[PDB]
Amino acid sequence: WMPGLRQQRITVDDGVEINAWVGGQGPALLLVHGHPQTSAIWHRVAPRLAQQFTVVLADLRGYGDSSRPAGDPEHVNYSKRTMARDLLRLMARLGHEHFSVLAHDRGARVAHRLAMDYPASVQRLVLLDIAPTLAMYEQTGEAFARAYWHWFFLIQPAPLPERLIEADPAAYVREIMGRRSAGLAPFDPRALAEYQRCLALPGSAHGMCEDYRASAGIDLDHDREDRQLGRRLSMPLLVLWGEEGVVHRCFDPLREWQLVADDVRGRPLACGHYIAEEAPDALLDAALPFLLQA
Amino acid sequence: SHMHTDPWMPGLRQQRITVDDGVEINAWVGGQGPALLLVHGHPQTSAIWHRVAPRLAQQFTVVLADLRGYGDSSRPAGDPEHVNYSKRTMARDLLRLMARLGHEHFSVLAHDRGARVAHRLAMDYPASVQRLVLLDIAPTLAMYEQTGEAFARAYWHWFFLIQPAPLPERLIEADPAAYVREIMGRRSAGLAPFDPRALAEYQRCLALPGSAHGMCEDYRASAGIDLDHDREDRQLGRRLSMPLLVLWGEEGVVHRCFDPLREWQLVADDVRGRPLACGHYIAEEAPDALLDAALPFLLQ
Structure with a gap:
């Protein structure tokens, strides 16, 4: 295991600590999980990656063993801008002013915003x-x-979705993850x-x-401003999604990324949503x- | 408008009427004149009609029915295909309810889930339904x-309540009063x-x-199954034959997200309708406008 x-815990905001697993050697690589999971998602690929990268597997705020800050009416505290600043500062305090990013689910969204807000810090992006x-x-x-019913349930005003999750968190994890294709x-x-x-x-x-x-809400305001002003991702981007997942069925992922990024490559993989655990070897292949040419 | 002093029913x-095997329908029956079935929706009961029923009972024999699973009616078990709570089954419930009360022909005033039941009822038994207000x-x-x-x-529950058991049930049973309060109260007043x-x-009742x-x-x-039945009706060109009046709230989601009159004209041959200056809960927010x-329409 790892x-x-x-x-390691690094204070990234006033009363906000980020828990992360740090190891390896070489260029810096930030690994970012999503919902409803933690840095643990990377346990199958992290050893291999650590042979050529200094890997930093970060738990987003609200997840894993990181801080659980309070919310706020406009949701600034959990905006992608704020969570991206969390990760930027994490990498800074660990001595990495420039790094690549491998991210999944919520993390990838955070990474997107990170790469827009601090393009000089992100060398390559894998989403x-x-x-x-x-x-x-x-x-x-x-x-x-x-299929992604939670995108419309979890956004409802507190305390409703919280009631669901806290009534039985283990059951929540099992139903969110086991009801998907794999x-x-x-x-x-x-x-x-x-x-x-952790949940x-x-x-x-x-x-x-x-x-x-x-x-x-606010995240979509930031993304829309980027769109209207013609602000796009400038650094190399690789996008991988599961052929068996909802994203594949309901959207054109590569096209959507070409609209908001200037240097994009991608393709589907023979798996579902949880790429790093269902198909670790394909993910690494x-x-x-891409990450090594950086 | 509503006062503690207003009369209640x-x-x-x-009355409780057996309409299916181990399924009884609780209903408030009264009045005089032609028969009128009143059907509520979610997350409510026949009580929703308490503002308009006193007036209606002056000219109709009213039957305010609790849907199965709702109010004081039976709560039979589910099943993998969801036949037990399909709109076909609930519509047959109400047909049999009116039959056992002595009404083979009746008008219908229905809201929310009840209105959907009413749609299916009027398609499956057109000779029993004289007029329809949804x-x-x-x-x-x-x-x-x-x-x-x-x-x-807006209609997040349309995608949460359909998820496989036991998830949405867990939400509801963790705090039912909060569920009602949050489902119904999320607005300015x-x-x-x-x-x-x-x-x-x-x-x-919840x-x-x-x-x-x-x-x-x-x-x-x-x-699921209800949509199979509805698509079958659409494919075979089967439409509501009797007069249909559709009233929806100008301040609600249906108005904002669809063209209600057009959509009903696609599935009914004799339709008129319009928005009212209120939200979803028409019978309680705007009883006088509803009756006006x-x-x-119901008296013709």
């Missing part, structure tokens, strides 16, 4: 099973709303246990829901060449 | 087919527009054991 990596949040909400149809088969027991332990920490439900609420 | 008596709905099939960002944001007795009824699963089964059917618009 051979060669040691867990897993996402299309841009703004396009995904704008292009919502019946199929997407049925079921619960691809998840290592230790990893599932981590997701459930149960106090304040987690509200933090996750605040992330979603911002991504249905597709991403190591 | 004056002239009506509560409140703040467009047809379920068009509403799902035309889902966009705004609709999914909150729960003020609902008479205290009516809100108390909705909360008491808290009865088995309620969450029944309501979720209704929604699941409306995202509907009594002429």
Whole structure:
């Protein structure tokens, strides 16, 4: 489990600490998970990556063992701008002013904003099973709303979605993850246990829901401003999504990324949403060449 | 408008009628004149009609029915295909209810889930339904087919309550009173527009054991088998033959996200309708406007 990596906490905001697993050697590589998971998602690929990169597997705020800050009416505290600043400062305090990013689900969205807000810090970008949040909400149809129901449940005003999550957090993890195409088969027991332990920490439900609420509000304002002003990702971008997942069925991922990024390459993989755990070898085959030419 | 002093169901008596095997329908029956079935929706009960029923009972024999899974009616088990709470089954419930009360031909005033039941009822038994008034709905099939960002944001439950058990049930049963308060109150005036007795009824009845699963089964059917039946009607060119009046709230989601009159014209041959200056809960927010618009239609 995480051979060669040691867990570290770095204060990134006033009363906000980010928990991360740091190890390896070489150029810096920030690994960012999504919902409802933690840095543990990277346990199958992190050893290999650590042979040529200094890997930093970060737990987003509200997730894992990081701080669980309070929400706020406009959802600034869990905006992608704020969470991206969390990760920028994390890498800075660990001595990495320039780094690559490998990200999944919520993390990838954070990474997107990070790469727009601080382009000089992000060398390369690899985003897993996402299309841009703004396009995904704008292009919502019946199929997407049925499958990604949480994108419309978790954004509802507190305390509703929190009631659901906290009534039975372990059941929440199991139903969110096992009702997708691959079921619960691809998840290592230790990893599932981590997701459930961390999801149960106090304040987690509200933090996750605040992330979603911002991504249905203020985050879309920031993304729309970028769109209207012609501001796009400048650095090399690799986008990988699961052929068996909702993103593949309901959107044109590569097209959507070409609209908001200038140097984009990507393709589907023979798996579902949870790429790093369902298809770690395919993920590495597709991403190591790209991240190593950086 | 609503006052603690207003009468509660004056002239009506509560009745339980067996309409299916182990399924009884609770209903308030009263009045004089031609028969009129009143059908509520979610997350409420027959109590929703308490503002308009005293007046209506002056010219109709009114039957305010509690849907199965709702109010004081039975809460039968679900099933993998969601037949037990399909709109076909609930419509047959109401047909049999009116039959056992001695009414083979009747008019219908219905809201929300009840209106959807009414749609199916009027399609499956057109000779029994004389006139139809449907409140703040467009047809379920068009509403799902035309889902966009705004609709999914506003009618989030249409995509939460349909998820496989036990998830939405967990939400509802963790705090049923909060579910009612949050579902109904999310607007500028909150729960003020609902008479205290009516809100108390909705909360008491939703808290009865088995309620969450029944309501979720209704929604699941409306995202599955019900849509099979409705698409079959559309493909075969079967439409509502009797007069249809559709009234929806100008301030509600249906108005914002669809063209209700057009959508009903696609599935009915004799339709008229218009928005009212209120939200979703027409019968409680604007009882006088509701009656002004509907009594002429129901009396012809």
